[PDB]
Amino acid sequence: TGRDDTKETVYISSIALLKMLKHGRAGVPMEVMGLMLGEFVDDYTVNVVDVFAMPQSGTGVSVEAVDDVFQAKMMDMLKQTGRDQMVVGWYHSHPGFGCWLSSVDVNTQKSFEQLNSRAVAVVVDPIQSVKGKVVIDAFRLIDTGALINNLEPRQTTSNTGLLNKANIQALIHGLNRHYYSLNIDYHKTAKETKMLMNLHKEQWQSGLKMYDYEEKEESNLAATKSMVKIAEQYSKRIEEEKELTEEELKTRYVGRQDPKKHLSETADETLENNIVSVLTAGVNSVAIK
Amino acid sequence: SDIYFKLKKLEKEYELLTLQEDYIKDEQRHLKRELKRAQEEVKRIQSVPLVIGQFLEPIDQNTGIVSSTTGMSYVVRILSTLDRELLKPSMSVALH
Amino acid sequence: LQSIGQLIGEVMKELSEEKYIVKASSGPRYIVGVRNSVDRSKLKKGVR
Amino acid sequence: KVRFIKDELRLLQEPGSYVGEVIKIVSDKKVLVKVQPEGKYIVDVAKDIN
Amino acid sequence: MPNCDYLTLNKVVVNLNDAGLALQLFKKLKEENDEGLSAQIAFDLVSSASQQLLEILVTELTAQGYDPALLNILSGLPTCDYYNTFLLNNKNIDIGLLNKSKSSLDGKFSLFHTAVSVANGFMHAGTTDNSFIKANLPWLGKAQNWAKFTATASLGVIHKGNLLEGKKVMAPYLPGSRASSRFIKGGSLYGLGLIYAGFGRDTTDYLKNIIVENSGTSGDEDVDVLLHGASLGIGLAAMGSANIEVYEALKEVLYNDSATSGEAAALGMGLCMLGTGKPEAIHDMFTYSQETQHGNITRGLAVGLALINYGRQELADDLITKMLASDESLLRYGGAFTIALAYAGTGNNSAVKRL
Amino acid sequence: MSLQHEKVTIAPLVLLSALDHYERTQTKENKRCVGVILGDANSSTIRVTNSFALPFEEDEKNSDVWFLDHNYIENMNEMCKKINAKEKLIGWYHSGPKLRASDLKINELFKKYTQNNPLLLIVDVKQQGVGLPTDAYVAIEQVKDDGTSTEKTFLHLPCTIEAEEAEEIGVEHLLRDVRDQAAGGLSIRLTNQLKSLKGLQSKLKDVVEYLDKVINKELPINHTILGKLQDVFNLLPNLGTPDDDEIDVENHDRINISNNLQKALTVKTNDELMVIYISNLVRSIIAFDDLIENKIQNKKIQEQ
Amino acid sequence: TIQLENADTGTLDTKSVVGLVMFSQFWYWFPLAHFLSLSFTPTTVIGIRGSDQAIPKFQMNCYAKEDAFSY
């Protein structure tokens, strides 16, 4: 044939993720749209370098609800700064339901497909997102020819061949009907990594400050006293231990959320803080004068 | 002596065991940092927003039955290192 | 439009100094956080 | 210890579970189930129970 | 010494990998010539060594003057033919492979088709076998994509060896004698390089024409798939023969920014010039790895770096630190395998800790 | 204009955008990408939400020569009011690497478009300082320290950087390091004490040096610097005072509790030992029992 | 069978090792997965009848063991 009908693994930068997410969530509940600017290379790579949002609508995303006068005006700026790049797909946020596509969004999808042969749709649902990465997938049109003549899974070949689900129920429904989903990847250069992270100027101040001592008499006093109540129960657990079954041990003497595990945990965690506190205090006095 | 010249090659082999022994300490450190990271996610879920139910009865001891003020009724999984002794009496509970 | 509506409730019970428990006029009870814009003196148990 | 906390955080992250009660068995190896706060939904049984 | 066992003399020639000790070996047996002792060592030398050594030696034996009996054996020519003859007699076809592929799986799905195509080549290795081929004829025939590449490629592995039938199996599927699709045409060149993997000076001369014709062009999709298999074909068939014609020809393809065929070019360079420790290879490969933003081409260059650094040990520590320090996913990936190949086939403490 | 401006929080979208723009205008070798900074202001906390490049030139021969496009700003402001309601021009960024005195002159013109005092937000594109690269400034006017010449000069506003909870999740998990914005165990907190002290060391050196160059080179006097640094000496602790004696009572209290915590953990690991010692006797008996029990089984087969 | 190190002379073959590295990599390109063909080395005793370079068929003794399958 004349095609290879394969979907790209989508590389989304640092620069693009935050813009997509910030606009989706401030704007939610209300479906919102905007284009994605990038670079196309290969047939298995598509870059989402930058993005810009396009104005709100309460009629959801349609081809009759977009502002083309706005798109034009932006591309005119884009040329005067010398940053012009080609449109590589489009992004939208659904307002409250998982990544899937409705009919209205297939109509919007179809025309980006015509404009640029390969293009992606990245769909951000920012209120089922909690790791900044979950419930964000890319999608791409499946042709009607692809279903009936089995030219749909040529995108499972010459790639990793894995698809990682965020919503099992929601993806699987549109996976045969009207889209094929392929997994998303993230990227940055090393200049970006350092910027994204930052180094704090208060990182050095909080190192060299020993906290108030009123809060420290309280800390030691409270902690050492609390470990007496559970120290006693640690004996009663192990009165017998030669009895079979781990759940059994916990049911006889009420060792549920074990007194060995809790008491130890308390011993390690107050211990970590006290060593660091005597360290900070001794550092400041010897250092400064 | 024959054993002794065969040894030379054995001693190199024991040296890779030495390097396994140095390698454990490097794996250990990675896991310990990460156990605290794994735990941080679960604290996000413990805290706000929450939606208030009323705890009915345990049906297991790791999975319960609740009701909500949402207008519905669910089966929910009980997260660990929390009290299972204070779900016996029906009392208000919070679900994520 | 970009500012987006809200839903009225009232403090069912003050639980902390930055966190409150409320009942909404949609029916449901929530445990909510409080923004640092708004005062916590003007928040007291039973206030809209 | 890492696998255990990871396992638990995952249970939360699944959407919920509900509760019903089998009212009848039909001949297509489906079951009519009454979901207690909502309506009745008739559905193919699970792939590990019969 | 005048009375020794030559099995052990051969041990030394192979391990060090020197054509000068190899010749010094055949001088003793030119003054003490019995055709049996001389041929026996000759056969054992080819079998055990690399191809690279044998080529250097042959030149030395035509200058010296020798029997043509010895000259055939150390071209490595008759050694191929015996193996085929054995595999002819003793081949056995599995029923479990045919049944499961036929009934359950389909060649209509790309990922399935490819797996069945990978298997077939390994299973029926030796002489041609047509039992897989004529039964699963509509299944092979109903492929799509690069699953069609896989199918064509498998013909070469099964019909491995054979210098008197190994150009005839690929003869209708060759470019200029087919036009069915770009996949069949390029996967037949990929296949031809597996028939004539190891030895194949003659397979090199043919594929060289295919490379230098299409240089400058991969702005057609057809050309890109055709040349993909053509660049892999020559790296396999010329592997370790040290041609600076191949290395130079494939730089045009790489600099053109060929989409699938830049990955191929990178591997095809490094195979030929493998273990030479070429300073120019290491340098050229590295620069254009950093340079190309296409992800396929970087990966091929990153792996092809490894190959040059076969057998370096200590002088590959400059390379290894550069590959691993980079923040590119592809550079580090091949960076591990610089360490695999340098100390390959004997242990090493420094290498095991680093990894 | 504005008399409310204490701190400028910066989201990492803004810091990255500025960084990108420098490298997508092809402006390098200490030439300047200058852009407008967008977001809410006229608040104690200034928050910069977004940024975009402006057309900009400079000639370093004469810095009283530069190109700023007058069409472009208006058009961008109109567009930017649509996307978020947050966005309005609250200053301009400079790409650094330092604060040139050429930056006043630009700031002077920039005041006209703005609805506030414009901010001069330096974002360094090459990383610097034990502290942040990003340092914020506001144009104010004041009298010098020679009591002569009222000069418009730039008031440092400190920075800590912040992002909404919308952006932040994507930051935390994209990051694939240790982080200086989060921390793990004790081991990482030993690191932190070495890093924090190293920053003091370097910073002290700058203060001494500054004192040198005033009395050598003879740069003009500043009672802002000299006056603040006067305070430092009276704040200074000294040794031999009753106060240090009260530190030592607290150091005994905290190490003693750390001793009892350690003893406790000796009994904990003394438990694990036991469980294993019990496990060892049970495993060894049943392991052997099986072998014996198998011999009898085999024996039935042999007999007929 | 694959042979990592041949016992003909008892010394490493380079070609063998290369083949395995190319086979194991196929992660972003599954089409590239025929590369065991340098790695497979034939296992059979093959004679020569004198210097005629023709294979004689004759009988050789083998000490242990009688297999019920190779088919």
mmCIF file of N, CA, C and O in Angstrom, chain A residues 26-28 56, chain C residues 1-4:
data_model
loop_
_atom_site.group_PDB
_atom_site.id
_atom_site.type_symbol
_atom_site.label_atom_id
_atom_site.label_comp_id
_atom_site.label_asym_id
_atom_site.label_seq_id
_atom_site.Cartn_x
_atom_site.Cartn_y
_atom_site.Cartn_z
ATOM 1 N N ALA A 26 -7.995 25.256 35.399
ATOM 2 C CA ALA A 26 -8.554 26.568 35.825
ATOM 3 C C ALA A 26 -9.843 26.652 35.075
ATOM 4 O O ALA A 26 -10.821 27.204 35.549
ATOM 5 N N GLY A 27 -9.810 26.131 33.846
ATOM 6 C CA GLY A 27 -10.952 26.262 32.941
ATOM 7 C C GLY A 27 -12.044 25.257 33.183
ATOM 8 O O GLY A 27 -13.141 25.307 32.633
ATOM 9 N N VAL A 28 -11.790 24.203 34.024
ATOM 10 C CA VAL A 28 -12.733 23.102 34.269
ATOM 11 C C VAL A 28 -13.649 23.407 35.442
ATOM 12 O O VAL A 28 -13.158 23.942 36.399
ATOM 13 N N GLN A 56 -12.246 30.105 25.417
ATOM 14 C CA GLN A 56 -13.420 29.409 25.970
ATOM 15 C C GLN A 56 -14.680 29.501 25.163
ATOM 16 O O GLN A 56 -14.997 30.441 24.441
ATOM 17 N N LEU C 1 -16.262 34.382 32.850
ATOM 18 C CA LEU C 1 -16.506 32.994 32.581
ATOM 19 C C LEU C 1 -15.410 32.085 33.089
ATOM 20 O O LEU C 1 -15.699 30.881 33.351
ATOM 21 N N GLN C 2 -14.158 32.684 33.116
ATOM 22 C CA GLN C 2 -12.990 32.001 33.359
ATOM 23 C C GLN C 2 -12.822 31.857 34.880
ATOM 24 O O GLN C 2 -12.073 31.026 35.417
ATOM 25 N N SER C 3 -13.639 32.678 35.648
ATOM 26 C CA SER C 3 -13.593 32.699 37.077
ATOM 27 C C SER C 3 -14.363 31.530 37.711
ATOM 28 O O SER C 3 -13.890 30.938 38.709
ATOM 29 N N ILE C 4 -15.463 31.139 37.114
ATOM 30 C CA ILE C 4 -16.176 29.921 37.421
ATOM 31 C C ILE C 4 -16.912 29.999 38.777
ATOM 32 O O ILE C 4 -16.307 30.333 39.783
#
